[PDB]
Paper text:
Hsp90 is an essential molecular chaperone responsible for the folding and activation of hundreds of ‘client’ proteins, including the glucocorticoid receptor (GR). SHRs, including the glucocorticoid receptor (GR), are hormone-regulated transcription factors that depend on Hsp90 for function throughout their lifetimes. Although FKBP51 and FKBP52 are 70% similar in sequence, these co-chaperones have antagonistic functional effects on GR in vivo. FKBP51 inhibits GR ligand binding, nuclear translocation and transcriptional activity, while FKBP52 potentiates each of these fundamental GR activities.
We obtained a 3.23 Å cryo-EM reconstruction of GR:Hsp90:FKBP51. However, in the GR:Hsp90:FKBP51 complex, the FK1 domain contacts GR at a different angle relative to the GR:Hsp90:FKBP52 complex. Thus, the FK1:GR interface is distinct between the two complexes, specifically at the functionally important, but divergent, residue 119 in the proline-rich loop (FKBP51L119 and FKBP52P119), which we investigated further below.
Numbering used by the authors:
A (entry chain D): 13 to 421
B (entry chain C): 519 to 777
C (entry chain A): 15 to 225, 283 to 701
D (entry chain B): 15 to 225, 283 to 703, 724 to 732
The structure:
Amino acid sequence: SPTATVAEQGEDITSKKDRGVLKIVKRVGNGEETPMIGDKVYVHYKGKLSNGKKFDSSHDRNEPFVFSLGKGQVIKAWDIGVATMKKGEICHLLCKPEYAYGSAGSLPKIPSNATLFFEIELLDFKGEDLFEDGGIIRRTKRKGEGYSNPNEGATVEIHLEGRCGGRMFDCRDVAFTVGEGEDHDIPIGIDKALEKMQREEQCILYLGPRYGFGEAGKPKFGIEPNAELIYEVTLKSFEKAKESWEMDTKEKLEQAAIVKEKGTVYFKGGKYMQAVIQYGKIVSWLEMEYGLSEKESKASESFLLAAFLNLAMCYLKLREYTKAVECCDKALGLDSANEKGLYRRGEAQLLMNEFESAKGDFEKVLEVNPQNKAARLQISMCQKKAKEHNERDRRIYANMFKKFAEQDA
Amino acid sequence: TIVPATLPQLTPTLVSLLEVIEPEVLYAGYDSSVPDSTWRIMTTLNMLGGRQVIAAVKWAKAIPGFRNLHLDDQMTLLQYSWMSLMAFALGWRSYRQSSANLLCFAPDLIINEQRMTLPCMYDQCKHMLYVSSELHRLQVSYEEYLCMKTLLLLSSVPKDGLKSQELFDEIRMTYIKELGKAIVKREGNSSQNWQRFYQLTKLLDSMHEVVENLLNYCFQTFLDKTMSIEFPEMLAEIITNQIPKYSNGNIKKLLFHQK
Amino acid sequence: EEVETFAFQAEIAQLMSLIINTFYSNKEIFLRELISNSSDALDKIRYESLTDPSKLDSGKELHINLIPNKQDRTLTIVDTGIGMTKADLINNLGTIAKSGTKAFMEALQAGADISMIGQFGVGFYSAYLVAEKVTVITKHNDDEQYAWESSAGGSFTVRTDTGEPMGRGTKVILHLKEDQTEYLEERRIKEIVKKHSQFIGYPITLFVEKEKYIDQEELNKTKPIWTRNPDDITNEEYGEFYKSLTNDWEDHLAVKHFSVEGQLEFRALLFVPRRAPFDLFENRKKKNNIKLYVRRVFIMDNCEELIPEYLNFIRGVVDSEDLPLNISREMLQQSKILKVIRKNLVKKCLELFTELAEDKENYKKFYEQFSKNIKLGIHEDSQNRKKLSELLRYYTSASGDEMVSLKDYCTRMKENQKHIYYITGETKDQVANSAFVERLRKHGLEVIYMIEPIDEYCVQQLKEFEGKTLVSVTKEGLELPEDEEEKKKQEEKKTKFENLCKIMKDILEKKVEKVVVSNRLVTSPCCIVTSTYGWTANMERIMKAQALRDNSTMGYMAAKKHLEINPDHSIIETLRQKAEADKNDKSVKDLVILLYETALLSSGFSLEDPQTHANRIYRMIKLGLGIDED
Amino acid sequence: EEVETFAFQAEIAQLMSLIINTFYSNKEIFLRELISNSSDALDKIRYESLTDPSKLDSGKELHINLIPNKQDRTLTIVDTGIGMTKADLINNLGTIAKSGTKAFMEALQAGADISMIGQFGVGFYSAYLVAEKVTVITKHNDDEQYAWESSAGGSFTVRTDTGEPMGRGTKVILHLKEDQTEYLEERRIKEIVKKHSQFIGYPITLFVEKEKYIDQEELNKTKPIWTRNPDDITNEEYGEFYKSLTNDWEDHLAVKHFSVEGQLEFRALLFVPRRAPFDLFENRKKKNNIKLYVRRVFIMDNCEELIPEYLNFIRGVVDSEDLPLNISREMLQQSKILKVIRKNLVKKCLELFTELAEDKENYKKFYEQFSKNIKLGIHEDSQNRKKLSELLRYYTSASGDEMVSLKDYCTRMKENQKHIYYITGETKDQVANSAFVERLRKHGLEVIYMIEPIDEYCVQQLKEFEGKTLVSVTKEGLELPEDEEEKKKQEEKKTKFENLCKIMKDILEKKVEKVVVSNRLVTSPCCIVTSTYGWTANMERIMKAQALRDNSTMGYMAAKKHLEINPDHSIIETLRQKAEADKNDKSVKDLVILLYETALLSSGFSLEDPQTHANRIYRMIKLGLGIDEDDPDTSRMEEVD
Ligand SMILES: Nc1ncnc2c1ncn2[C@@H]1O[C@H](COP(=O)(O)OP(=O)(O)OP(=O)(O)O)[C@@H](O)[C@H]1O
Ligand SMILES: Nc1ncnc2c1ncn2[C@@H]1O[C@H](COP(=O)(O)OP(=O)(O)OP(=O)(O)O)[C@@H](O)[C@H]1O
Ligand SMILES: C[C@@H]1C[C@H]2[C@@H]3CCC4=CC(=O)C=C[C@]4(C)[C@@]3(F)[C@@H](O)C[C@]2(C)[C@@]1(O)C(=O)CO
Ligand SMILES: [Mg+2]
Ligand SMILES: [Mg+2]
């Protein structure tokens, strides 16, 4: 059995000389010859146990095995593996028991030392992942602590190269807080990228069209690739954000007042993303049980309702009536007569071409405030738009049955 | 005139659906050059715990019947039984990986008897190994095991009940029925199936003690500050919110079987 | 003619063989019989002690001990009953078909309450079903201890007992057959005792060895509470009894404790579960659930003859006295008796449900689990439809989410109604919003929404309720209490629309029996309606979905279809005008098809093309979307 | 010590009572026993006459006569068998457990072929189930005639018979109970006799007075044939027998005649009818139409233990001469015997079906009537599933119009075709033209068309044929052996329309689990498929329609709908571009819904509320025809807080 023969054969790939990995690789194909590091790399493979036994597993279905982390994660044999893997390489790397199923093993089914090698056809391994929402390309040099990351509310110390997309901007080591994504012109998506970064993590961060200032066209950067703001960022230190379950009842009310003012400013400044962020913190705190008396609970409701309504407007400008609708619904669940929410939701509906719901909301605005002519105007507009749509249909569909009868020659 | 047709029975799939839903085991461990100090062991376990606990949430969401519960209740059940489920998962993995009453947590994490160095384990070995020893003694299979695991998800309620109670009760009977079937088709017995069912139920009922005692220890580890232990925010939030529910008696235990 | 007279004789050797080899179907019963005789022995002494307490001077505890002995491969059964004198060991154990018990009973005063297990004189001998040798040790108060022994070879012996004193009572020792050792196991014993003898009045203790010491385990802990006057039993007691009886954990939902004192005498407890029963553990599929006991001894548990299947969710016990039984005591003689019992069981089940229903919340809990069975009882068991139907509950248009009784529908009827209107369909919502009920809603008439597949089977039998006729609103010929002026208008409409009726029939020739002008629709231009005699769309879809089929089933049950036209509809007026202007306008042809086809779906029929429907729509979409022909 | 030894005794009075009152439940069997005694009497003389022919000098006809007498409430049974001498008369009728028959056989040499019915010694007394008194007159060749007479009073008498000579044999007269005259009626007799005798080796004549004269009818004209060597029986003979037994004007379709030797002796005949019974699965009476006889005497019927229900259409008889019976001879004593019988009967039925299948014409006739039973067997019988599957026949997309074998399928399959594909649905037309098979047909792959609702059960359990698994073409993940170039082209298509997948999903968030780009379609703009697990279309509607079911299970088992889009349809391409231009375009929203509703109908799902689909259509008609007649403070909104 050739797969058993190779159990003790191969070139030396080591960490440990008496264990390690046997390079029994049959060939290198079609792809870059450089060993590569990267995420979401899918490979196909078939194989056998080091003792020559056919393995009863997913390789017989050509499983598209994925390498989830840049330097590997779930198969010690293949992660030790990635370090020497090339695109197009057809690997046969037999890794001794320390790389098999671990100290526990996968027993009851598989003993810890029942190792394998497979004929693995490799996909390009260069490059780590981007982002769940897209907008950023992340590449790493050094892992951080692994037990600690910034969370919004914490100031962080970030080393910045000064570089950005082959160009320079006011990129400097910064004792960054989240509001700075807009206040200090620091690419805005950094606000969330930092929460995944671990202390002392070294990562190259590309901030794309909506993650960076591409769409904004900020002249402050003045970088032709304003939409590709890529440079090294190192998270060197940070403080700990106090969590909403760590913060006290009064502490959360106090911060809601502080944050509310920041949010108001951001809103007015056109910094709707930051306004949303500040209002986001306000709402998540306020939604929690505080143990307040009935009159004290109104400080919470006041901050909460205001945040919903401010968010609704931020979203009316940032998003096409999506979260804005939800915010209004929340504002109205809290206060069914708040004409601001009734009105703003009604606009969100009209602006999505939902004429019936828009009219209903504006009618409600006027029950609360019969003099709020804004709703009266919106109702008239809803009616007019509905008329326009009805006319378009007549232009297309009128007398189609005849058209069809004649086409049918 | 008309005779209603009889009904052939469709392949029951709840057990195989659960087999599909169950997640793969996660890795945990630490740099072996570091001794297994009280705080290192706890840290390794805490990080694994938070990751396994979140996997348990999507796992629960994926379960037929469960998924139709009001979301608040779905999350309530996960908190109240998070310990039950984790302990059960551990106990089974242990005894199947080895007949020894060890704790098998991850591909790289085993706590053998000589490694039960945490004060918490020394005091709770009688509870954490209650479960692995008993499942071993009864030679519990994977499938009847899964049926029981699901019932543990459904083993506790608020003292004030759930909103979708008239579903919850259905879901429990549904999985009770599946457990019965899981036993009958494998044992080949009659009166002994009745008894095996009760013998297994008794684990799940006695596990209420297993959990309160283990629970109080996890509360103590998180609450005090005597050990250099990192904890994930997830578990820390759960415990912060769970401690007063426990101490106020707001969590009700369910009794699965008598007779 | 001198005539010789002879007595009858018997051959003992063969008689013994029949006793052992051709009366019994099983071996469980060897224990059952030994225990029964033992309990009678105890009861006899208990009785004697009533007038002479000194009878118990030799010992007062009346109990039965089962003592298996694996090492010796034996089983010993011990009691403290009367015991036997030397004379009785010889007469009663040495005589086939002698019955000491019977003689005892015969010798009793008329007022005696000794509900003795009666007997034939054969049963002891069943011991040899499992034993190679049987030894009986006994002490009677009036005699010495003696040891009786036999291998049933046509003799037996009597020895003076020189061993340990008993005080009083009988000890039976079986020396078991080499290959039947399961009777030495705890599990087998417990199953047998529980199954046949759990209601014997004297405590039974099983003595076994474990780490060593002997574990004394009582088995018959439950009392046969049905023997008590019903008024003295609390709900907790019924509940506990029930749980032990059925190995449940839930309590009963309802119970009826009933007795009969006529030609036959018996008592029974019938329980209604709080949850529909299910096969938690393997059993005979659809075994019925009423057990029959005679004199507190289990006799039979799956007698189909006792109760209709629709009432098989009732759990319960019937305990009779003095029924003629088969020699094996496994079966009842004269099955005409079962017929009588069934009559009474059903009669009382109905009273229970009638009463249960007074509690609206509980009725709901009931009905949610058990409505299917009620409905089967309508379909079947025709003599009871008149009462069962009152237990039905339905959603109606005026009920919102409440279900109401048919009597509620009735009380709310208008003076012009002669009929109860109902509609059937797949879901609530599809029925409630249907075109078929638009004019009924207009005039404020109540409609019943029938939903379950079962409802279609059932509706066929329920022709009349309290004198009102039940009618469907999906059949042609629906009668509404309309005025003369509208009727005249309808005729005028027929006159102008008949041209379409004919044209549409020429179109679409094979799809309908006819096309008519209708007075039932408001907003729909049309619908598909069923014939007066025939089957509805719902019936067809049900029949076409069943596992059990024939060709004749639908060759016979297929529905006829008729197309109804809303005269008052704007599409319809357009067609009248267009079609009259040109009978061959091909666009009319296509419009006729879409109205029909759409009507088919909206009326509950499967669309068989089905692709053609989709294709017509795709063409319309291309236009709507601005996609040209090429 | 001194040990006394005693014999066992019996109390005759009680013994007599028990035999009469507790051993039997069916009074009618008294006739069965009187006849059995009689046939033994005849057979015994026949045996003796084999070596000594003078034994029959006293009379040569061996027969049984039944002579009811209305007028005197009596029944007489007459035979010409050995008869009894005075000594035998007293010893055998006066001893409760004596069996002369048993002794007789014991007195014979090994090799005698004769098999008697009796052996217990008590059957005679069953006469008293219906008789008040009985009289027995008998003549033995070696003695005079004697008349035995008694009530079951503990004693009996013997008289010299001073009446007419009977030549030879025994005459039994019952004086019937005043209330038991139903057994005196010609109809009832004949029915009992038919039921319990049927295959008695000697003829029975029933003598009935009519306007008078006596009508002498021979009962049991039909002889058992299973006792004969099968090689010796013509097909017509089997058919004649069959028709007689079943009152079937039609002949049998197939028959299997076999025997089993060793431990339990068997002979059996199994017949396959040419028509399925109309109530085959509906009758509420027991389904196994197999009768069990012992020594040619009927014992039992309607026993579930003998045959699995799926084979409840086989008509037949099982006969043995060695099984233990209870005292009434109404059942076997050891139920484990039935287990063995069943194993063998089933094995042979399957052999018969296999043989039948070789005749293509006959198999078709069979299958047309009984394919339901085969399919049920697949569902219920886990052991013979592996053979039963060979008997299935289905229409396929490449069979034209005849049904073919699963083997036929797999012998036409293509080198890269690793899987067997099938579709299920209401009718052949619907499946044949379904969107789901458009690519498969285009590539030349064969699809099995399953139609019956029961087909849905077989597809669960069959799983694979000769290692080739089954694939439903209505589920997600359908795999075709596509080329690399084809895959690359699809990869590019799949990075397009992503926005549509998302937009449509938002529109349909509450309707579908997913919206994806697909490849099973080549003509049609879209379709609905079900995910890997759960009920599929058809399976779900079937379950909903079951008359009796637990509806709560439908909250667990239900389809998970995925919407597949055909990227190379013009509707789809237009929407792609249009939707990208405006995410809220009202017309996009409206058209997406119609495609969805349409796809459900064409995909085999019911539609949730038809009075919407219809309304969408009605307004389109009105536009199409031009029928438009009925279808023609503010600053607070800006405030920031
Ligand atoms: N344990 C005992 N103690 C005292 N007397 C006994 C005992 N067992 C049997 N006998 C006596 O022996 C007699 C023999 O009756 P046997 O018990 O054989 O009938 P049976 O088993 O009651 O009959 P059946 O099976 O019809 O119920 C009884 O009538 C009784 O007087
Ligand atoms: N018509 C008859 N002619 C000759 N002998 C008879 C006749 N009827 C009865 N006998 C004799 O009486 C004996 C007793 O018969 P009986 O029917 O009681 O016993 P059995 O047939 O063994 O009972 P079972 O049918 O239960 O086995 C027979 O063995 C036989 O010798
Ligand atoms: C006594 C408690 C109970 C423990 C846990 C019991 C259940 C469990 C099962 C597993 O498969 C993995 C981790 C956990 C979830 C656990 F092992 C660890 O997290 C550490 C733990 C909380 C504890 O040991 C601590 O005191 C640490 O705070
Ligand atoms: Mg007795
Ligand atoms: Mg006889």
